[PDB]
Amino acid sequence: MELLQVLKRGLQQVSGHGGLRGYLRVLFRANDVRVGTLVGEDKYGNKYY
Amino acid sequence: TSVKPIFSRDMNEAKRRVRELYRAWYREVPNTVHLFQLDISVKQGRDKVREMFKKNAHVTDPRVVDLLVIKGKMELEETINVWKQRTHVMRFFHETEAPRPKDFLSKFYVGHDP
Amino acid sequence: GVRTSPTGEKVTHTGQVYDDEDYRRVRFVGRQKEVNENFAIDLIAEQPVSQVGSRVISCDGGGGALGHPRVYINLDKETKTGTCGYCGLQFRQQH
Amino acid sequence: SRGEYVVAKLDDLINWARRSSLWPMTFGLACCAVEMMHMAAPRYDMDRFGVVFRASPRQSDVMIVAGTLTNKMAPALRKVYDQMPEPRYVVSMGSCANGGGYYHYSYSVVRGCDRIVPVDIYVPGCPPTAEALLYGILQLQKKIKREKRLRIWYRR
Amino acid sequence: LHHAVIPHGKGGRSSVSGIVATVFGATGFLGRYLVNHLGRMGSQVIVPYRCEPYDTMHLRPMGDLGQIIFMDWNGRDKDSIRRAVEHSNVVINLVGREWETKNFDFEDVFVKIPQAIAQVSKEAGVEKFIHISHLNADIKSSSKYLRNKAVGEKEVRETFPEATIIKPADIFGREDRFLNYFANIRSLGKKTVKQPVYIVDVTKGIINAIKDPDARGKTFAFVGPNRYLLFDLVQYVFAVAHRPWTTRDKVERIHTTDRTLPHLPGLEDLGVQATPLELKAIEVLRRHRTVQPAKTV
Amino acid sequence: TRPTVRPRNDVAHKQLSAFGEYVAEILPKYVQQVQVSCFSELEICIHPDGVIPVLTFLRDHSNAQFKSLADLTAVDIPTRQNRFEIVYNLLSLRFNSRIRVKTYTDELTPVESSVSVYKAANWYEREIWDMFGVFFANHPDLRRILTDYGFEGHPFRKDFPLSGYVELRYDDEVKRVVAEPVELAQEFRKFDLNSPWEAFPAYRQPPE
Amino acid sequence: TYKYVNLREPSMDMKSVTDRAAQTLLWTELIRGLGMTLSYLFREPATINYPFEKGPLSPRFRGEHALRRYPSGEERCIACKLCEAVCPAQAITIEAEPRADGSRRTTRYDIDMTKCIYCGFCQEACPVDAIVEGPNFEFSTETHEELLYNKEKLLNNGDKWEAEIAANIQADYLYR
Amino acid sequence: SNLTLNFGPGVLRLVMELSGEMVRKCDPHIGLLHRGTEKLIEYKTYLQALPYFDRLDYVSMMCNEQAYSLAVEKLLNIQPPPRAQWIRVLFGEITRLLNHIMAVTTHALDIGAMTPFFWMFEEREKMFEFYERVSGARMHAAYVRPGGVHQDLPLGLMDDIYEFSKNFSLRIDELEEMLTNNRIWRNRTVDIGVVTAEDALNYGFSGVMLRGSGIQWDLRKTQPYDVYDQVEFDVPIGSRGDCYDRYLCRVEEMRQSIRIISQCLNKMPPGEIKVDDAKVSPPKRAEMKTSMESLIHHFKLYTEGYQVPPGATYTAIEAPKGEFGVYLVSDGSSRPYRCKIKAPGFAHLAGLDKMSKGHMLADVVAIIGTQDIVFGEVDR
Amino acid sequence: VKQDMPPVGGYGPIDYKRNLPRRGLSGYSMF
Numbered sequence A: 001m002e003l004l005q006v007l008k009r010g011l012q013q014v015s016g017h018g019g020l021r022g023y024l025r026v027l028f029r030a031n032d033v034r035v036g037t038l039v040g041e042d043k044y045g046n047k048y049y
Numbered sequence B: 001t002s003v004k005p006i007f008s009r010d011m012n013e014a015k016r017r018v019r020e021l022y023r024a025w026y027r028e029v030p031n032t033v034h035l036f037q038l039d040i041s042v043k044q045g046r047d048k049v050r051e052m053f054k055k056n057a058h059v060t061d062p063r064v065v066d067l068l069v070i071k072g073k074m075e076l077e078e079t080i081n082v083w084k085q086r087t088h089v090m091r092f093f094h095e096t097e098a099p100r101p102k103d104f105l106s107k108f109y110v111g112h113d114p
Numbered sequence C: 001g002v003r004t005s006p007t008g009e010k011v012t013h014t015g016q017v018y019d020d021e022d023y024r025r026v027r028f029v030g031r032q033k034e035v036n037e038n039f040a041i042d043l044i045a046e047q048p049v050s051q052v053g054s055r056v057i058s059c060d061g062g063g064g065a066l067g068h069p070r071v072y073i074n075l076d077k078e079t080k081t082g083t084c085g086y087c088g089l090q091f092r093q094q095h
Numbered sequence D: 001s002r003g004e005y006v007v008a009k010l011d012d013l014i015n016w017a018r019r020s021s022l023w024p025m026t027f028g029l030a031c032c033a034v035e036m037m038h039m040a041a042p043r044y045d046m047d048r049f050g051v052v053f054r055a056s057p058r059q060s061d062v063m064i065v066a067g068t069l070t071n072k073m074a075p076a077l078r079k080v081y082d083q084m085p086e087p088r089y090v091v092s093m094g095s096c097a098n099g100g101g102y103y104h105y106s107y108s109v110v111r112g113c114d115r116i117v118p119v120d121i122y123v124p125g126c127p128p129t130a131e132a133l134l135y136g137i138l139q140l141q142k143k144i145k146r147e148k149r150l151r152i153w154y155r156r
Numbered sequence E: 001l002h003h004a005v006i007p008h009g010k011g012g013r014s015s016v017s018g019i020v021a022t023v024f025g026a027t028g029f030l031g032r033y034l035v036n037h038l039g040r041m042g043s044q045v046i047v048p049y050r051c052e053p054y055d056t057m058h059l060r061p062m063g064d065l066g067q068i069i070f071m072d073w074n075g076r077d078k079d080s081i082r083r084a085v086e087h088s089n090v091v092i093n094l095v096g097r098e099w100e101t102k103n104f105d106f107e108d109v110f111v112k113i114p115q116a117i118a119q120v121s122k123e124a125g126v127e128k129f130i131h132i133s134h135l136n137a138d139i140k141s142s143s144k145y146l147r148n149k150a151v152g153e154k155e156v157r158e159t160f161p162e163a164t165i166i167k168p169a170d171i172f173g174r175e176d177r178f179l180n181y182f183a184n185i186r187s188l189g190k191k192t193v194k195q196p197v198y199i200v201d202v203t204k205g206i207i208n209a210i211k212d213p214d215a216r217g218k219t220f221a222f223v224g225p226n227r228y229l230l231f232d233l234v235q236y237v238f239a240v241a242h243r244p245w246t247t248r249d250k251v252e253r254i255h256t257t258d259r260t261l262p263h264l265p266g267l268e269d270l271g272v273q274a275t276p277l278e279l280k281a282i283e284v285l286r287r288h289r290t291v292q293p294a295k296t297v
Numbered sequence F: 001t002r003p004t005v006r007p008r009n010d011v012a013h014k015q016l017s018a019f020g021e022y023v024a025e026i027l028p029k030y031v032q033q034v035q036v037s038c039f040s041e042l043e044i045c046i047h048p049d050g051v052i053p054v055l056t057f058l059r060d061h062s063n064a065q066f067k068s069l070a071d072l073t074a075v076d077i078p079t080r081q082n083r084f085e086i087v088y089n090l091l092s093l094r095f096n097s098r099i100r101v102k103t104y105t106d107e108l109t110p111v112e113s114s115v116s117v118y119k120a121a122n123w124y125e126r127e128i129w130d131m132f133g134v135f136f137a138n139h140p141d142l143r144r145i146l147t148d149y150g151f152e153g154h155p156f157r158k159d160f161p162l163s164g165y166v167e168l169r170y171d172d173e174v175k176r177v178v179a180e181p182v183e184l185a186q187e188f189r190k191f192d193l194n195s196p197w198e199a200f201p202a203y204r205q206p207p208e
Numbered sequence G: 001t002y003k004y005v006n007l008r009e010p011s012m013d014m015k016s017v018t019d020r021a022a023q024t025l026l027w028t029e030l031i032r033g034l035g036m037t038l039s040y041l042f043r044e045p046a047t048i049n050y051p052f053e054k055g056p057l058s059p060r061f062r063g064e065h066a067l068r069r070y071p072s073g074e075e076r077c078i079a080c081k082l083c084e085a086v087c088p089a090q091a092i093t094i095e096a097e098p099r100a101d102g103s104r105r106t107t108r109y110d111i112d113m114t115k116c117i118y119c120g121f122c123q124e125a126c127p128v129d130a131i132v133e134g135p136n137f138e139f140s141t142e143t144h145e146e147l148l149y150n151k152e153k154l155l156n157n158g159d160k161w162e163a164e165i166a167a168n169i170q171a172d173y174l175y176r
Numbered sequence H: 001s002n003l004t005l006n007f008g009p010g011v012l013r014l015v016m017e018l019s020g021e022m023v024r025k026c027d028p029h030i031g032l033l034h035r036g037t038e039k040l041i042e043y044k045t046y047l048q049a050l051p052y053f054d055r056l057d058y059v060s061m062m063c064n065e066q067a068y069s070l071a072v073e074k075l076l077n078i079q080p081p082p083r084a085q086w087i088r089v090l091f092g093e094i095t096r097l098l099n100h101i102m103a104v105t106t107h108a109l110d111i112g113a114m115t116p117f118f119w120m121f122e123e124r125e126k127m128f129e130f131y132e133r134v135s136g137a138r139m140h141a142a143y144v145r146p147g148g149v150h151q152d153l154p155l156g157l158m159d160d161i162y163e164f165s166k167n168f169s170l171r172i173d174e175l176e177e178m179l180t181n182n183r184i185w186r187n188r189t190v191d192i193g194v195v196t197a198e199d200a201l202n203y204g205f206s207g208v209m210l211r212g213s214g215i216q217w218d219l220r221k222t223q224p225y226d227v228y229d230q231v232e233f234d235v236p237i238g239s240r241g242d243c244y245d246r247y248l249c250r251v252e253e254m255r256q257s258i259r260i261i262s263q264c265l266n267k268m269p270p271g272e273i274k275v276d277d278a279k280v281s282p283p284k285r286a287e288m289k290t291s292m293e294s295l296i297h298h299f300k301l302y303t304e305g306y307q308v309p310p311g312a313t314y315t316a317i318e319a320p321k322g323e324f325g326v327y328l329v330s331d332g333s334s335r336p337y338r339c340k341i342k343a344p345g346f347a348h349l350a351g352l353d354k355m356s357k358g359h360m361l362a363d364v365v366a367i368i369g370t371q372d373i374v375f376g377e378v379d380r
Numbered sequence I: 001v002k003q004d005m006p007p008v009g010g011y012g013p014i015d016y017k018r019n020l021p022r023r024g025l026s027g028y029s030m031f
């Protein structure tokens, strides 16, 4: 079943934002919870994915 | 010196058209004060109509006063039909404009304009 | 190379500063007078004079087509360096 | 004090509601309107910010002046502005609405809609991009966020 | 006279009038039309504001770009007053409240703040200072408003001896609290005589007091051309408005007769023709519609 | 002269010259000039009494059939005593061709309206009334179409200034948009751009 | 070389008449339209997450103006007034003089960003790449006069955005 | 008596004389966007006058650029290089897609079908990315100039135009699935705004307003400009003169624009993009900074501008709204003496009064939709 | 020279016609 892969991608988004705290952090600051490869970080703390 | 007329063959027909336009504006001023809910009186609007007619009172060319009657009829059509707003009717009354210096001495005081 | 008037207002690289009795300082009250503190007249004086072995040198400002139109500078005066009219880089014949 | 904290939290609440439920009335005057239509288009999608597409003028919260304001339409602009209920805001969009723009020296053009209505946000460009207009709307939301209505009421 | 403050232009919006005005209380009823009439000349107008900046938005179309400078101020902060007046060549005081609040009584609004503005404007080198008292200001008045406003007039006169003090009687206009008070009261009729003055007459008088060098040190009384009894005035207001928030101090001031001061100059000595009520009461009271004129004395 | 030069169309030039001769000899009562430009456009310069007979000819003649009025235009040339140059651009879909009919008037002589020939003219000459002040006689509803309602003057006249004479602003005292004499914070900067060297010797005017 | 939209005569046999009657009574094309709307319901939307995601741009993009420098700190503008001559809005106002080392430099370089039509004729008229129309489009202001840029603002925009402007010019100058 | 409704302030004032549901008289008051564009053109050079044409029909920017450029190039007696002409036809048909998306989707939005607006404006956003990649601006490109185009295509742009064009016909298909066979859309368009062929010719109509009435006229076929005689496409012809056949003509013109764009992508030639007369088009920046003649010509073209020989042309194109014309009069100087702008929407909105007689008030917004009216070009 | 050009064989075929795919049962079958 491919719905289980969808639920596992959601759970690994929760795991990839460093747990539920970072998940809710990016959910409420970003309105977006998808994970990406960290391309970089500037001298201010802006992270680029 | 032989030119093509617009409406009037001479100045008498031209004065007839001026006179009918003045009659129509005189009849229209109370309705204009009412439906635009202006803050002026009917006497003040009729004085403004008389001022606008007397401003052009020096013209002796029948074609020029024919065009003045045509433009006055256009302004009246824009007034009777509600095409003007209240602002366009009140632009004849330069109310926010400060009074210009009239004599030599006050024009000397304020600036360089003759 | 910014400096400061006795009013406390910064003087621009043009030399603009309002007078003390000028009312137009009130536009900076509670706000700031934006000046650029990288004065181009001081930065081009920091560049060293290029010693070349030719009588006539060419300058395009560097970068080829990214610079300025290529001009030719005579270096026959030994009293004065040869200054580019576009970029302000200056040249000296080494003999 | 206790009442200062209460009016601070109530200011934060009403500013949250007003900036997260901005309803715009867009004056679609000229080319800028097209770009406003791209800020409602699915790429930028103003509706996900709470910014509804084409609110009616008597229930709108911000007037977006998007286009050239001519002399023949400036009383209609002022009339629609006067019919907007408070709190009303005005975003000036693009060079002709901001200062006259390409038609600044024209006999028939108002040199900026700030001669007619008070303007909160000036969005520059000819046209500004839909992303730049969305930037200006989010800057208007930040301007609403730091309003101090009940704190100034409590201090007066 | 500095070169940037020499007058230029034809007196329009982009012109330079040479007037650099700090208008305290510009966000109110008189300040609205004063900043209007200053900004249409091309004056530099400094608006110190206490309120939300939203509530200053209507002052922004009134002048050319950079001709209205908004800045925060506090009435109990002399640093903000000095920050607002130190570039101006005229300071107008329009600070007032019809009611006393929790933080500001009539002594704060009418004595403390005007004396602070006048003292700081004196020690900042401001040439002209205009203060707005009330016509019925008296030490032995029955209302706390008029008592504190007479005390504040005295203190403004003694700390800025060249101040132009202006006595308006009862100012009517679109945003007044005189005809709009009577039209929304739906208190009674007594032997009170009033001559209300129109707001554009008051504004023209203030700006002619800016331009007249003879208005320094004077006390003007801005009154309307027609004195009315209170009863038939209120009946005229209910007749024009097509009709069949208050405090007891406001009731004491409505039942206070507008005194006659012939020794003080008025609007005619500043070149202002006082507009009668019957020309402008329809313009005020057209909003209240869902006429034989009042009898003068 | 191959790559950068526009190629000349001699066939269309010859055809439009023959048709210009045709129009000039069918209608000698009104046709004053006939010219064909080097980019092959035909201009029939007529007397203003023949606005209706020429345009009805070109609309209805079987060898013309200029059924479409593409554009109607005035040009202000103040050095002429008939300063306004009324320009009709006509399209024949049958013969795939365009023609230009030009006439003239001053400020006071009315031009006969061509709404009875082309109803398309109804707004265009109305625009010519608004922008230039040319009165069109026997027009159905002649009034302004583009300027503001109380607008004084005709803006596309070359003695009318670029910014006008009045400008609008909202005045809060009268609660109304008001018109005032125009003051610009920055004057329009007039550029004198013309080189003092002759550009085109083929267009040299003969001297005094 | 031409085609006739809507010149189909419908078939009048009982098959096609019954097809059209079934379409009329059973609302077939309406269910087709509902199917197309339902099909977009299950598509990923085109919405990017502004401000965290940005609309794609090119290095040619005409945004906020900037005055540039040489790689020595010397400003590129030699006051030739080509940009204000070509400026279709007359948004540019230039005054100049020789400065203290005799260099031809501006004392006034104003761009009214509310007159400006953002067409980039100034950067293509500029012989030394001094004025550029950079990549910034997020510079909305709360007041009209904050968009009346003087030379100090434009030089600070150059010093602010030069790391991006030089790389955009590097990507595009061979097309110019 | 009969009712008079003043539908106040694109933006339009309408004075309706209604007799119940029916429309007796429709008087469109315009000038709400009259900006005096063509008086401003007289005080500017030809290059300076070019960006005013972006802002007339502001959903058809590069087409109006092309019409003005063709007028100036006709008066200059010069021709653009072939690659410039192919770029102009490519972006003119991209522009035609932009305008017909705007036309069809806002005409559906004003009737009540709000969803294909949102579906097609993402495709419109991708074409604005094409404008931005070729010129730097999403809408007012100032790209098609007298002499050719301003700048050559960036590398990889034609591949992305191919990737757009390969998928755009499915977008037209789902628009046409939403509207064309829909009985509600047919009830709002089929008997609405019927124009006869003779009245459409007499009222100065052009474009789809002629072709919906069956008139076989298209200026890309009959009076062809840059390389439109080298591309193969069909001209959709209506049969009933109504809103619905004009809708179908605009949809099929989007189809044929995709066809032309495929032919332009396959037949794009190499070479320069400006005319190689440096007294007309500015030289390249590398030779401007190296050659004396090139620097002089750069200086004079960007300050004085090129002198145009004296004369008057009427140059028209098949813009997506119809015949877009410029009557351009040069006095010999580097500034236009006169520039009359013929817009299709002017005569179309003049014909609105005949088109709306005998219809309902809800039909008038459909007729103002089927006349593709942008008031920038209507009012100038 | 290097210029934005089509590839060597040109681009692939681009669909441009109406494709309304004619789905559904017959009118006989739907009653």
Ligand SMILES: CCCCCCCCCCCCCCCCCC(=O)OC[C@H](COP(=O)([O-])OCC[N+](C)(C)C)OC(=O)CCCCCCCCCCCCCCCCC
Binding pocket: G024, G025, G026, G027, G030, G031, G034, H183, I031
């Ligand atoms: C619990 C669910 C309830 C809802 C179910 C449906 C949900 C989905 C609806 C989607 C569409 C919604 C669209 C909104 C607008 C609707 C417009 C519309 O359709 O208008 C009505 C349209 C109007 O059609 P029209 O007017 O457009 O078509 C032209 C018609 N002439 C040519 C005659 C003028 O259709 C109807 O009026 C049909 C009414 C319903 C009929 C139902 C079927 C009856 C069949 C009986 C058997 C017949 C057998 C053959 C005869 C022999 C008998 C013995």
Ligand SMILES: CCCCCCCCCCCCCCCCCC(=O)OC[C@H](COP(=O)(O)OCCN)OC(=O)CCCCCCCCCCCCCCCCC
Binding pocket: A028
């Ligand atoms: C039948 C069921 C019906 C259900 C109806 C309601 C459905 C939606 C329910 C809520 C969904 C989640 C909402 C989350 C709101 C945002 C919370 C949040 O994080 O707010 C942050 C904000 C600022 O916090 P700050 O401390 O400044 O952050 C800096 C951190 N370093 O802090 C704040 O803003 C202050 C805290 C605000 C908390 C608001 C919580 C939501 C209230 C919704 C009302 C209804 C609640 C449920 C009612 C039914 C059940 C009892």
Ligand SMILES: CCCCCCCCCCCCCCCCCC(=O)OC[C@H](COP(=O)(O)OCCN)OC(=O)CCCCCCCCCCCCCCCCC
Binding pocket: A028, A029, A030, D005, D006, D009, D010, D012, D013, D016, D145
């Ligand atoms: C004595 C102390 C108490 C005094 C009285 C107050 C009672 C409680 C009132 C609600 C809580 C007060 C604080 C309100 C929010 C303040 C903080 C805030 O604004 O946080 C911002 C945060 C979102 O951040 P933002 O800046 O919007 O982000 C930009 C987008 N990236 O915002 C969020 O994360 C969401 C904020 C949600 C706000 C709370 C939820 C709504 C209000 C519910 C109660 C009132 C309504 C009752 C029911 C109405 C009808 C349904």
Ligand SMILES: NC(=O)C1=CN([C@@H]2O[C@H](COP(=O)(O)OP(=O)(O)OC[C@H]3O[C@@H](n4cnc5c(N)ncnc54)[C@H](OP(=O)(O)O)[C@@H]3O)[C@@H](O)[C@H]2O)C=CC1
Binding pocket: D156, E024, E025, E026, E027, E028, E029, E030, E031, E049, E050, E051, E074, E075, E093, E094, E095, E096, E097, E098, E104, E109, E132, E133, E134, E135, E167, E168, E169, E170, E171, E172, E177, E178
């Ligand atoms: N009928 C009349 O109007 C007459 C008025 N006067 C006097 O003329 C003056 C102006 O009148 P008017 O415009 O009608 O009055 P308003 O009440 O309308 O406005 C008064 C102004 O003073 C400000 N203000 C009030 N209290 C304070 C305070 N404690 N600290 C700082 N600012 C304060 C207000 O600002 P904010 O909006 O922030 O509260 C407002 O800008 C007053 O002094 C009044 O007494 C005299 C005769 C007649």
Ligand code: SF4
Binding pocket: D030, D031, D032, D033, D066, D067, D068, D093, D094, D095, D096, D097, D101, D102, D125, D126, D127, D128, H055, H058, H140
């Ligand atoms: S600022 Fe520019 S793009 Fe915007 S409406 Fe004005 S002319 Fe059109």
Ligand code: SF4
Binding pocket: G083, G086, G087, G088, G089, G090, G091, G092, G111, G115, G116, G117, G118, G119, G120, G121, G122, G123, G133
């Ligand atoms: S982008 Fe165009 S309008 Fe703006 S400053 Fe440059 S030349 Fe002037």
Ligand code: SF4
Binding pocket: G076, G077, G078, G079, G080, G081, G082, G083, G084, G094, G122, G125, G126, G127, G128, G129, G130, G131
């Ligand atoms: S074109 Fe360039 S060098 Fe010349 S004045 Fe303008 S910015 Fe300076």
Ligand SMILES: [Zn+2]
Binding pocket: C059, C060, C061, C068, C084, C085, C086, C087, C088, C089
């Ligand atoms: Zn150099």
